[PDB]
């Protein structure tokens, strides 16, 4: 809790859905947004901060709260858009040999600035005396170790808590999340949403020799007609769907009501039947 990681993760597809099956987490209360909508929002960089606290201290990790650990080791303002992912770790971090390794900085002068790591080891000086290093009646060790033991109960067990602080500065977003992919359909007028390029058409097989850097493709007069598959390299062709004009030939509503229908721009195989120019 006094020296916590600050992993700045960026330039990846953060699939938060995988975290629901890695370890049996016991707390996944995301205060900022919903985990379903989190996978559809881009971000610049995520700050991963992990630590280990007791069971009765997990409730102290909140966007604004006082306590022996909430304002002395790690404080969260009222803008945390991440999660409070935490889980019990009483399977490998509890042996009967003396757990004089951790600490929680019981002594302090005042509340620390939120999102700050103070790595200090000086002797706590309680005023009215210059302590150049002494341990008696005026200046003591401001650090105290825990008493984690395997043969204990719930509430005082080692709980690993990891937070993922999010930020959106004036920088291009790198991490966005997972990307769903559908199956390919060829020779059928359907919709497509290829890498932002949205539309409808008949994805057919083309013989165009695209350059190794080109992705999209247009026509003589401002119309997308071919794109590159985001999957394995293949050159497609986007022709518009089956459309045309309809005209009605009618001898007039005075002798009969039989009418003829002329579809313009069709080979009688895309709608007696006759095919004319």
């Amino acid at each position: 809790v006094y020296a916590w990681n600050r992993k700045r993760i960026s330039n990846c597809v953060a699939d938060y859905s995988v975290l629901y099956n890695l370890a049996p987490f016991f707390t996944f209360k995301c205060y900022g947004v919903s985990p379903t909508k989190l996978n559809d929002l881009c971000f610049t960089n995520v700050y991963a901060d992990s630590f280990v606290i007791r069971g009765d201290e997990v409730r102290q990790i909140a966007p604004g709260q006082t306590g022996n650990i909430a304002d002395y080791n790690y404080k969260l303002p009222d803008d945390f858009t991440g999660c409070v992912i935490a889980w019990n770790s009483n399977k490998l971090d509890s042996k009967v040999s003396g757990n004089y390794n951790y600490l929680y900085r019981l002594f302090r002068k005042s509340n620390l600035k939120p999102f700050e790591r103070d790595i200090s080891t000086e002797i706590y000086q309680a005023g009215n005396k210059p302590c150049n290093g002494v341990a008696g009646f005026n200046c003591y060790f401001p650090l105290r170790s825990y008493s984690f033991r395997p043969t204990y109960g719930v509430g005082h067990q080692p709980y690993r808590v990891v937070v993922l602080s999010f930020e959106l500065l004036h920088a291009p977003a790198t991490v966005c999340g997972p990307k769903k992919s559908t199956n390919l359909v060829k020779n059928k007028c359907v919709n497509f949403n290829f890498n932002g390029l949205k539309g409808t058409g008949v994805l057919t097989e083309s013989n165009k020799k695209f350059l190794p850097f080109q992705q999209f493709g247009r026509d003589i007069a401002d119309t997308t007609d071919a794109v590159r598959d985001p999957q394995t390299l293949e050159i497609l062709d986007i022709t518009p769907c089956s459309f045309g004009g309809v005209s009605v030939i009618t001898p007039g509503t005075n002798t009969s009501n039989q009418v003829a229908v002329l579809y313009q721009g069709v080979n009688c195989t895309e709608v007696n039947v006759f095919q004319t120019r």
Partner: single-chain antibody
Framework: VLTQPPSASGSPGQSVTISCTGT?????????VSWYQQHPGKAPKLMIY???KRPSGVPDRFSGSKSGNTASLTVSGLQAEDEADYYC???????????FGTGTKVTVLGGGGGSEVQLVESGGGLIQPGGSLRLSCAAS????????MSWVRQAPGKGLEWVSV???????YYADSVKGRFTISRDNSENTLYLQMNSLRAEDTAVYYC???????????????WGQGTTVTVSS
């Protein structure tokens, strides 16, 4: 709520071995059970804080091992003339007051801190019901603005209980008895640190004690120094 024997007078100093049951757990986390010797008149004095390593004092009271689910403080062979009350502290859970125990009469016979830092109070004689009375414990020695102090009240017959806990500079937690009607306000950071009554509800007639150190999360703090209390004597 803890379990303590009402009285203990048979076999003085041979098989007394008082304790405090009613825990039904492993003392939570840090196993630190303190023992306070409340004496009529002057303020109580610390006797032992951990299961071993007794502080500077009487050496005939040690071996406070935790047997089963209770710390059995070995008191046999101490003396045969004492009139006080032994109180034990446990239940160190997060934000849980009333850690003291009931009145245990450990009088083996029945019939037969002063200049350390400072000891001052307000002297609330004939307190009018309501209003706002301020009580201070100005200490010219240890800093009254950096250490973790507490306020504990006790009434005739009833035992002690946590009434006010204040951290360094970023916590103003109140007890469950007041539930909000008590507001702690710190005085100047270099003069003293006083309290506030804030329209008591006729239950604050108990006498107060401003301790320089915590009770349940007690630290060594060099030495445990207390101060004498004053009678409220409300006229509601």
């Amino acid at each position: 709520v803890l379990t303590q024997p009402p009285s203990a007078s048979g076999s003085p100093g041979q098989s007394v071995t008082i304790s405090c049951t009613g825990t039904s757990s492993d003392f939570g986390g840090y196993n630190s059970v303190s023992w306070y010797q409340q004496h009529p008149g002057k303020a109580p004095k610390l006797m032992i804080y951990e299961v071993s390593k007794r502080p500077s004092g009487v050496p005939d009271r040690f071996s406070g091992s935790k047997s089963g689910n209770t710390a059995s403080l070995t008191v046999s062979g101490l003396q045969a003339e004492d009139e006080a009350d032994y109180y034990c502290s446990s239940y160190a859970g997060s934000n849980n007051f009333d850690v003291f125990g009931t009145g245990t009469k450990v009088t083996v016979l029945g019939g037969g801190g002063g200049s350390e830092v400072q000891l001052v109070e307000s002297g609330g004689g004939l307190i009018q019901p309501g209003g706002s009375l301020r009580l201070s414990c100005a200490a010219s020695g240890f800093t009254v603005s950096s250490n973790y102090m507490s306020w504990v009240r006790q009434a005739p017959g009833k035992g002690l209980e946590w009434v006010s806990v204040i951290y360094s500079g970023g916590s103003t937690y109140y007890a469950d008895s007041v539930k909000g009607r008590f507001t702690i306000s710190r005085d100047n950071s270099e003069n003293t640190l006083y309290l506030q009554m804030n329209s008591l509800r006729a239950e604050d007639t108990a006498v107060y004690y401003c301790a320089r150190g915590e009770i349940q999360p007690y630290y060594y703090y060099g030495m445990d120094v207390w101060g004498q209390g004053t009678t409220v004597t409300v006229s509601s």
